[PDB]
Amino acid sequence: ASETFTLDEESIPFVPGQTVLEAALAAGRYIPHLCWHPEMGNHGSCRLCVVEANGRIQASCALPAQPGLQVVSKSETLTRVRRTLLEMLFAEGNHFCPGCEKSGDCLLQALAYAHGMTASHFDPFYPQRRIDASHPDLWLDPNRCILCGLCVRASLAEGKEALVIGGRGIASRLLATSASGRLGDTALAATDRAARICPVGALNFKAAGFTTPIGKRRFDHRPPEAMSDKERYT
């Protein structure tokens, strides 16, 4: 790192051509995100990583870092926009945490906690999609999926090509690439990277739930801001 830019009136080194998000995180400075992962890069979908620069609000994961670039990632506006985005993710799925085994181990949930989300003010959608449990070791709950793309990318990068996000608008969902459309008929396997990358409770292992006591779950004590890369990503 030779060159530098400014994040919240503080000097951040960067390598060309890192994005603002990549540089910020390498420097130990948090900007909220859901669909950025160190091995997979940025999907561009979640929009939690928005920041003020030039002089509009735009996604830090897509904004390349330039020398002297003036970036604000913390403001009243950005906090409210990020709150709204999280409330929208809650609204569109069936995020009933009390009945969810990823509770306390969920990045969406943790980010909502950290944004003081005391209640989603949007009327929820109550979608009616069914679990794909065709795979003998894995299951998919599409009503908890935040369409972050990380599973699809992991499966592509490791050469299994078992997953794809299809449909338009609200019809968008994760699907198997098999002819039958069952995960069981793909080459997906319990040892695949894609099988364990999901930041929420959507693409899960079977019969591995509720093994960690309350008070000892990944997000029980610290928020995402204050966590290492070992613990924040899977």
Binding site: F90, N94, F96, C97, P98, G99, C100, S103, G104, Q109, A112, Y113, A114, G116, T118, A119, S120, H121, D123, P124, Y126, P127, Q128, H221, P223
Partner: protein, 178 residues
Amino acid sequence: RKIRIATASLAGCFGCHMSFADIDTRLLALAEWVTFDRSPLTDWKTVGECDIALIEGGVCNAENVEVLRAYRRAARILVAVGACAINGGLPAQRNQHRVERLLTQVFEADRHLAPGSRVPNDPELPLLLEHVHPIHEIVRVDYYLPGCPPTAEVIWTFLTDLLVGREPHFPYPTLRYD
């Protein structure tokens, strides 16, 4: 004058009221500062008027809606306590289905029913809503108290804050949806 509190359990499990009770002997201290209006703990069949109304549960039928609206009129401050009141909670998990089919499933189709068993419908059973709704869909909510249930300590901190005019705050570690 003492501060007056009412509580309702609408479409809830009663668990937010038991977490309120989990303040333990602090309930004795509370009973010195406040008088209780309608509540599952008192015998008043009709509400009001009062300073704080603590609403557990959402709305799943027309009666729940009447009570909720009544509680709003009567109460200066109305608080949505718990997941059910805040977002619909477990009862709202029926909203993925048509309630008619669920009744048929439970009261006609189930294999352990008596022969010729039928979905109940009597003047005594009130009108079911199509979808269970969180209380803020009907009335204004002044404060939301998250959890399933919110812990005794979160309930204690919160209602102590209101009692001294202090603005409730929800810092990361105490804020839970389960």
